[PDB]
Amino acid sequence: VASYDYLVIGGGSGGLESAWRAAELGARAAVVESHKLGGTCVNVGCVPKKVMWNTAVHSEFMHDHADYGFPSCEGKFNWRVIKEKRDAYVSRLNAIYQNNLTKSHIEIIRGHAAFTSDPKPTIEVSGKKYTAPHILIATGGMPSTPHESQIPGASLGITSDGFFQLEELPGRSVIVGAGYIAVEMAGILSALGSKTSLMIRHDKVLRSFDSMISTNCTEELENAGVEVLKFSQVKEVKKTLSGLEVSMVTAVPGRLPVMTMIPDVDCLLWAIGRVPNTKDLSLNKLGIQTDDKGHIIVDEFQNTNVKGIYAVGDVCGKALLTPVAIAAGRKLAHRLFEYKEDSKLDYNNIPTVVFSHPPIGTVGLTEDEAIHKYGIENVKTYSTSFTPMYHAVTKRKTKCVMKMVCANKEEKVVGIHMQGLGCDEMLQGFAVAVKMGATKADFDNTVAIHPTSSEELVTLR
Amino acid sequence: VASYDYLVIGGGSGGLESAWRAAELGARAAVVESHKLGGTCVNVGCVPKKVMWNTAVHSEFMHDHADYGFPSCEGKFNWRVIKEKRDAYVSRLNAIYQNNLTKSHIEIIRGHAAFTSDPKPTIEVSGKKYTAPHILIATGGMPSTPHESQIPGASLGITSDGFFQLEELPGRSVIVGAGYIAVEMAGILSALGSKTSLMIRHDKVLRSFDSMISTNCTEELENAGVEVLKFSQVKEVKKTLSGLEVSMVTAVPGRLPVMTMIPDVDCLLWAIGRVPNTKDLSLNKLGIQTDDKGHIIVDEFQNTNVKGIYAVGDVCGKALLTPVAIAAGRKLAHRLFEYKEDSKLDYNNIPTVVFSHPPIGTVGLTEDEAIHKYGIENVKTYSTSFTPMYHAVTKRKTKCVMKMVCANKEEKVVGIHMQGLGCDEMLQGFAVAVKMGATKADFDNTVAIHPTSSEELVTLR
Numbered sequence A, B: 001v002a003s004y005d006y007l008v009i010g011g012g013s014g015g016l017e018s019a020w021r022a023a024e025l026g027a028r029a030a031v032v033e034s035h036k037l038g039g040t041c042v043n044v045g046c047v048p049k050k051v052m053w054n055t056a057v058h059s060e061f062m063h064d065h066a067d068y069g070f071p072s073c074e075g076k077f078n079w080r081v082i083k084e085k086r087d088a089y090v091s092r093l094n095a096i097y098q099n100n101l102t103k104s105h106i107e108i109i110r111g112h113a114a115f116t117s118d119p120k121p122t123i124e125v126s127g128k129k130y131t132a133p134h135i136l137i138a139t140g141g142m143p144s145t146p147h148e149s150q151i152p153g154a155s156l157g158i159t160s161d162g163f164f165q166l167e168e169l170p171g172r173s174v175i176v177g178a179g180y181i182a183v184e185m186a187g188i189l190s191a192l193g194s195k196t197s198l199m200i201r202h203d204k205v206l207r208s209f210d211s212m213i214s215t216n217c218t219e220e221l222e223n224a225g226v227e228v229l230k231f232s233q234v235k236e237v238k239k240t241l242s243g244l245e246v247s248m249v250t251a252v253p254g255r256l257p258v259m260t261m262i263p264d265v266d267c268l269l270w271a272i273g274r275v276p277n278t279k280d281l282s283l284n285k286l287g288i289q290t291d292d293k294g295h296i297i298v299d300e301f302q303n304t305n306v307k308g309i310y311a312v313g314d315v316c317g318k319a320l321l322t323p324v325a326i327a328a329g330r331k332l333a334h335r336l337f338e339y340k341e342d343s344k345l346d347y348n349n350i351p352t353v354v355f356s357h358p359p360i361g362t363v364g365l366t367e368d369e370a371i372h373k374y375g376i377e378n379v380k381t382y383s384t385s386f387t388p389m390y391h392a393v394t395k396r397k398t399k400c401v402m403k404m405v406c407a408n409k410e411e412k413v414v415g416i417h418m419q420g421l422g423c424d425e426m427l428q429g430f431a432v433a434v435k436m437g438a439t440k441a442d443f444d445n446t447v448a449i450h451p452t453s454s455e456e457l458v459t460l461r
């Protein structure tokens, strides 16, 4: 058994930051990674996705070519070309991440970690034992897929992982899910050409976001060639000699269920959820508590119930974002190694952008949550809806919706929600201002930047 | 002589806002406008310019087409097509502005106002006299042009106004100036195809912005096909049977002056400065004080030396931006009509974006100004320089530079400066945060939005 000061299991987003931060503080760390470093984000998440998004966004502006006085280009997107580059990039970030670890004197124990029956928390990677006074579990999660028992033929569909393994643009796509991933896949596949259908159990997507986003996003989706099959469920899936045959049930409230076949399907993508990578860690060896779905139960300080063990990131099941895993890994290192006893991540006012078309940006409370936190009498909301001047000369259109939620009589901005061009880069500042406890006056007392879509947020009346 | 409660001379940006704000407060107002309403911004500024910018930005992304797996389109931008649309839009905003005035019960006295020799401040528009207990001078400015006496042949060049009257894309362009306008024209003409040369008296452009912006902007300009002729001056201009012949002197410090001819010039654009529209107001009739260059001298509250007369906007010569004219017109109405005795515009931390390629965003103090305000010992600056992941797969490249200036030991962000993709929409939030008196911790305690260029600002180390 070899001792370190920190043994972080998982070379992902939260994993690495905590490892790096720890080393700066003089700690002797090592990171265990069983696959490629950089975790999900870099290999099958933020990075590969965003390249595909910039590409889909490219397909759109090309449509607007003639309106801007330019001749037209046919199209016929070559997926292979871009898949090759996307991959190259991803493999260049790998070398980089590895470099930085070794530059920081952080060992990388390549393999699969599992806890042992040894009294003090000790882990075993390929026969060898390693322990540390502080161990972090940053194993993240995996895409979930239905069971053949529930949906016979489920194994025939792919997931976001599989999406990143795709070599050519599928002619017909059906996506099952109504969250940001589902939406983003729907957006990219449809912009690049696949005849996309998004299949949701309800009438809207992103049903957890402010109602405006939920509503607008379902709209923009439809208005862009994506077919939204509301109130539908895949009953079973079959492999025909031409494609896949999705047998789905559609039960619109007030109507009788209608069974339907969607044939000639090239791709069936499962964007229904994420499961934790906890199973094979042998948590039961130490009695490390988890929930019914396998996530790892932690406190305000990422502590497990076992002294010396913490967990951060997707594995915990909360605020599943790279910057959140990162931020919590960062604060932990400062708590354990810098002794900042109250170093912890504030999970309120975490900003998030969905890369739909146009992009969604949001931070803070929804109207509902403000209503149920402060009371109707105390919640004011300001909003606007305009078409960006980019579409002043184009026949193709998209809107921009902005909503400001304000609490109490001072008008403390407790939440911002918006959708439209520039909203992806436009959100950070407001998240900082919002984090500071900005009121509607602070926003309204800032000189506008004209012409921008961002000036609308500071002139809401 | 007909009485109103407010008589605002000038249907521009500052003019209108003050008129509208006044009406909401129950005041009897009227606006005098001698031309099209909406002033400079709408007719020959923000609006027309920005359409041309979105168009130039379109030319660029088209270059990146093949890298994103799309076939290539030749090009051959048709200027007429877009000029027609840009104009249509501008004429649709006119109807709109007019509408809103009448909806607010604001009269529009169409014509040219001039003060009279009548004891109490009274103005005369086309024979008729009008007075008010409060009169606002929102007459803005005009593009300046050299005198034939100084630069013989100067009258042969056009200005930004003339640029908006252009019907076809000039084959060869030479721009004289090193400010945001000069730069923006250089950017658009060059992206759309003209063989552009930007002529500056020094080695860099935007010499008033933080040194980083000054430096980076001169670079990006060159790297995009714009020829920067540093240390050069147009000596005289001549109309040949093929184009114009710019005779210019180039005096690089340490070298002997070299006289040069630039022939076959289709366009000579004068972006050397703005002059105030004060001459014909007959200010001398009341002794309304002005400076040597004709701007109108005002105090913290936009007051002239004459009781009952104020001035806001470009006419004053300070912070020449639409949102600034607007913001000051707004505060004045609230002061005069809502009685907010201390309602005035704070001219510190006014945000500004230059629409260069990529866009520049800035707010606050430059390093120099922080250095000379706090002292070297008390100024820390953080910065980064990265290539946006949009260029991860493109052969064409651009950077992104970010600089944070921090004062004292708390690290109060007194200034932010940046250049690159998304910086135009990315700036508003930080301007609000900066306005609030945000420190580097508030920025650093905000959860990042990945992947974006904006996340870089909140992770500067």
Ligand SMILES: Cc1cc2nc3c(=O)[nH]c(=O)nc-3n(C[C@H](O)[C@H](O)[C@H](O)COP(=O)(O)OP(=O)(O)OC[C@H]3O[C@@H](n4cnc5c(N)ncnc54)[C@H](O)[C@@H]3O)c2cc1C
Pocket (backbone or CB within 6 Å): A009, A010, A011, A012, A013, A014, A015, A032, A033, A034, A035, A036, A037, A038, A039, A040, A041, A044, A045, A046, A047, A049, A111, A112, A113, A114, A138, A139, A140, A141, A160, A181, A277, A280, A281, A312, A313, A314, A315, A320, A321, A322, A323, A325, A326, B450, B451
């Ligand atoms: C499609 C798709 C797009 C996404 N897009 C975005 C986006 O734009 N922005 C965003 O913020 N988030 C996005 N996410 C979410 C983000 O990727 C995750 O929230 C984030 O990576 C979580 O970090 P983590 O540190 O817990 O784990 P992870 O980064 O997932 O990585 C865990 C690492 O641990 C390794 N490991 C697992 N178990 C063990 C073990 N027993 N021993 C050793 N090795 C092991 C894993 O192999 C992996 O490399 C996306 C996710 C998917 C899927």
Ligand SMILES: Cc1cc2nc3c(=O)[nH]c(=O)nc-3n(C[C@H](O)[C@H](O)[C@H](O)COP(=O)(O)OP(=O)(O)OC[C@H]3O[C@@H](n4cnc5c(N)ncnc54)[C@H](O)[C@@H]3O)c2cc1C
Pocket (backbone or CB within 6 Å): A450, A451, B009, B010, B011, B012, B013, B014, B015, B032, B033, B034, B035, B036, B037, B038, B039, B040, B041, B044, B045, B046, B047, B049, B111, B112, B113, B114, B138, B139, B140, B141, B160, B181, B277, B280, B281, B312, B313, B314, B315, B320, B321, B322, B323, B325, B326
């Ligand atoms: C190229 C170009 C691009 C620009 N781009 C931007 C940009 O992207 N963003 C930005 O913020 N700013 C930009 N500006 C600056 C902005 O346009 C001006 O700062 C702003 O319009 C100033 O407002 P104002 O209220 O003082 O006057 P103005 O809006 O200029 O208008 C004054 C009005 O008064 C009328 N008038 C004049 N004298 C009289 C008189 N005696 N009686 C009656 N009528 C009269 C004028 O005709 C005019 O319509 C740009 C300017 C130019 C030129």
Ligand SMILES: N[C@@H](CCC(=O)N[C@@H](CSSC[C@H](NC(=O)CC[C@H](N)C(=O)O)C(=O)NCC(=O)O)C(=O)NCC(=O)O)C(=O)O
Pocket (backbone or CB within 6 Å): A012, A013, A014, A016, A017, A018, A038, A041, A042, A046, A047, A093, A096, A097, A322, A323, A326, B386, B387, B388, B389, B390, B448, B450, B451, B452, B453, B454, B455, B456, B459
């Ligand atoms: N923000 C720009 C920068 C370009 C970019 O993608 N840069 C990164 C890829 S981000 S993909 C990986 C991801 N991000 C980061 O490493 C940097 C992003 C930001 N500083 C943040 O902390 O959120 C992550 O998993 N980090 C682990 C950790 O630090 O804990 C890279 O080149 N980095 C190499 C380097 O570090 O020099 C963009 O997104 O376009």
Ligand SMILES: N[C@@H](CCC(=O)N[C@@H](CSSC[C@H](NC(=O)CC[C@H](N)C(=O)O)C(=O)NCC(=O)O)C(=O)NCC(=O)O)C(=O)O
Pocket (backbone or CB within 6 Å): A386, A387, A388, A389, A390, A448, A450, A451, A452, A453, A454, A455, A456, A459, B012, B013, B014, B016, B017, B018, B038, B041, B042, B046, B047, B093, B096, B097, B322, B323, B326
């Ligand atoms: N911000 C979006 C909105 C689209 C847009 O251009 N909208 C404006 C043109 S801004 S061009 C004219 C300019 N801007 C405004 O009227 C609105 C911009 C913002 N609210 C601000 O106050 O800075 C101005 O001179 N205002 C005088 C004043 O209010 O004092 C328009 O349609 N307005 C019609 C309307 O008012 O409904 C964008 O720029 O793309």
